[PDB]
Amino acid sequence: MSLQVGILGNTFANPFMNAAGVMCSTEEELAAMTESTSGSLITKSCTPALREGNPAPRYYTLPLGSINSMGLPNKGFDFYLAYSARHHDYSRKPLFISISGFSAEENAEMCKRLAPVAAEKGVILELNLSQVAYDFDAMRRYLAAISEAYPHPFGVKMPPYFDFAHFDAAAEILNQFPKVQFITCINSIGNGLVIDVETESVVIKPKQGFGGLGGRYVFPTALANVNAFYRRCPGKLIFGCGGVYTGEDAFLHVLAGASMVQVGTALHEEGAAIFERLTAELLDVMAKKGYKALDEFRGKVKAM
Amino acid sequence: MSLQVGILGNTFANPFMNAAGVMCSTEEELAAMTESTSGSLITKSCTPALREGNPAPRYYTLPLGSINSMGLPNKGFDFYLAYSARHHDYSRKPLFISISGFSAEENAEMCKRLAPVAAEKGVILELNLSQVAYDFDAMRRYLAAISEAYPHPFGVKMPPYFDFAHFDAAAEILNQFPKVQFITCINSIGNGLVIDVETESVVIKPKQGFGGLGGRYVFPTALANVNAFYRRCPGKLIFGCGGVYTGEDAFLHVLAGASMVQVGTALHEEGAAIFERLTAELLDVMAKKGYKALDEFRGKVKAM
Ligand SMILES: Cc1cc2nc3c(=O)[nH]c(=O)nc-3n(C[C@H](O)[C@H](O)[C@H](O)COP(=O)(O)O)c2cc1C
Ligand SMILES: Cc1cc2nc3c(=O)[nH]c(=O)nc-3n(C[C@H](O)[C@H](O)[C@H](O)COP(=O)(O)O)c2cc1C
């Protein structure tokens, strides 16, 4: 039995990693993720320069998940590039860098600088399109600019879509770009609103309390997007993100088509130790079913 | 203390009703909803002719809600018109009729026939725009077609939106039609997917297991849409629909700005007695807080 995943020219010890933005902003956080049993790790979505982030409170723990309006707090692209350049131990695990510039041009500039580092160190780009991916002509324009600026393959982080026409429309643009080697589904379900009964107030300060939803709320939506893009993008990898708490949630993600599985809200709560539990629980499900490798049921969700 | 709602020229004993589609397809179900302590009720969304719907199973109970792809099974417009005209006891509570024709014309034709029944009996139309409302010119077209065809005010059932550009776009269109007197937020979060761990297969037969999500999954999305339209459409009523299982849930919908509160998945699981529990629970929250009427906190959600 193995949880290994052989993709992007790398051997990942297991399918698990953090979700971009969770436990990956500071130098100490990246080291904790490297030290952990996760198969990989991704940096916090960075901007060309340092950003303080939205006003606190900007994250709130719900019984069924989370709601947040962080506003891309990050130490700046320079910092994560340098972490990628000469601070990360590639001997432990492969590394993903999330970039999220406010324009096609900002991104393109970061990629031009990332390229030598990626070519030498092997760090992998995940472009956060989550908003751009909700405008299919903006999306094509981003992707064309990046593919012109960036010689290496990369991935894209997508917002959830909620109908087959959008799935088709997005997949069609993605399939025109060979360099996009993976698609991560999903970013938060956007602009939910949480209110406290006692205080009768929203629970986060920015955007009049409207924020991104994660956790148990988003699990069926994440599965749907993973499977929808798995079907429509046979030439790409799909990374699952959303609603993962147990090895069984992981199993379902993989069943729907996920190659890698990102953990957000659960990791935020349980900490880097969760990955040791997640691998054991996944191995458990597989043992109960006689599975020896993820390649044996990835994307093999059945009709009834 | 009172839960009365005075809207649309009617007095409602309380803000609770069923969601369209739940416990409202047969005479028996409609009788049960009328006999219940609900403030109102609404018929199954109907088509000009009877529909048998999608193949079974097309509904499945989730840990935190439901998934379904019913496919609009309904007894046909003639049936619900007859119920509205001849069978419903209006001295018991007001009645809503849901229509969901497949084209603008189908909807226009039904509205032409509903119009005299609405004038004499007082049944109130909810037009199901949920995908049509995800296309703003098609929405504009429908609304204009219906406003031409139908002399009375009506409401519209909306799908969820997930960003402020869409809230602004929809609001702008809705506010251009004075006959649109209420807006129901929300229909199902579209096209989620759930997979059983044991069978490794989807849990509903249609559309490869993709279906609309209901219940606790949709609640923060529901509140967000209720409040977003409450703010942008001050001339209209907002009806809340999504994730109501308790009186506190209803309290939050009202705090977000809901005038009526619709109950779907929870009603499906519990049955019509749920309305006496929901009223008692909502009265309990108001009592702890010293509220005597819903107007004292409707739409009064606080920012930080
Ligand atoms: C506090 C917080 C910060 C996040 N920051 C980012 C980010 O910088 N870039 C990004 O693509 N997603 C970000 N996300 C979204 C996650 O990467 C992921 O898409 C989502 O949380 C999946 O939900 P899950 O918590 O159920 O795993 C953030 C989420 C949270 C809760
Ligand atoms: C089995 C089922 C049938 C439904 N049928 C309709 C329908 O015919 N028309 C409609 O507008 N919404 C329909 N809905 C959606 C509900 O009206 C409601 O929008 C949704 O379930 C969210 O509310 P909830 O969380 O309380 O279930 C249906 C939902 C379910 C679960």
Whose C-alpha lies nearest to ligand 1, atom 29?
Answer: A21
A positions 71-130 inside 8 Å of B (CB): none
The burial class, CB within 10 Å (0-12 / 13-18 / 19+), for A56 is: exposed
Classified as helix, coil or strand, B241 is strand
**B300 to chain A: closest CA residue:** A200
Structure-token pair, residue A140: 């094509």
**Both tokens of residue B270?**
């519990």
Structure-block tokens of residue B284: 């309990």
Q: Say if ligand 2 is within 6 A of residue B244 CB.
A: yes
What technique solved it? X-ray
B155 neighbors B173 (Cβ within 8 angstroms): no
Q: Which residues pair with A157 in a beta bridge?
A: A128, A184
CA separation for the pair B222, B215 (Å, rounded): 10
Q: CB distance from A256 to chain B under 8 Å?
A: yes
Tell me the domains of chain B and their CATH numbers. Answer: 1-53+72-188+215-304 (3.20.20.70), 54-71+189-214 (2.30.26.10)
Classify residue A215 as left (phi > 0), alpha (psi -120 to 50) or beta: left
- Residue B79: exposure state from Cβ atoms within 10 A (0-12, 13-18, ≥19): middle
C-alpha to C-alpha distance for B41 and B253, rounded to whole angstroms: 18
**DSSP for A97-139?**
EEE--SSHHHHHHHHHHHHHHHHHH--EEEEE---GGGSHHHH
C-alpha A216/C-alpha A300 separation (Å) is 23
How many CA within 13 A on the CB side of residue A170?
Answer: 26
- Resolution in angstrom units: 2.1
DSSP A243: S
Phi, psi of A84 (to 5 degrees): -65, -40
> What tokens does B124 get?
């109130």
B18 Cβ neighbours under 8 A, 6+ residues apart: B24, B33, B38, B41, B42, B262, B263, B264, B267
Report the candidate in A275, A173, A155 with the shortest Cα–Cα distance to residue A232.
A173
Contact B205 A304 (CB under 8 A): yes
Dihedral angle computed from the Cα positions of residues A152, A153, A159 and A162, in that order, rounded to the nearest 10 degrees: 150
* Ligand 1 binding pocket, CB closer than 6 Å: A 19-22, 44-45, 59, 66, 68, 70, 72, 98, 128, 157, 186-188, 214-215, 218, 241-244, 263-265
The sign one gets for the Cα dihedral A279, A291, A260, A130 is negative
CB pairs < 8 Å spanning A and B: 143
DSSP state of A73: -
* Measured distance CA(A217)–CA(A303) in Å, rounded: 24
CA distances to A237, B12, B294 from B118, in Å: 55, 17, 28
Give the Cα separation of A188 and A214 in Å (integer).
5
CA distance linking residue A6 with residue A181, whole number of Å: 14
Strand runs (DSSP E) across B74-198, as ranges?
Answer: 95-99, 124-128, 154-158, 180-185, 189-193
CB contact under 8 A, B131 and A217: no
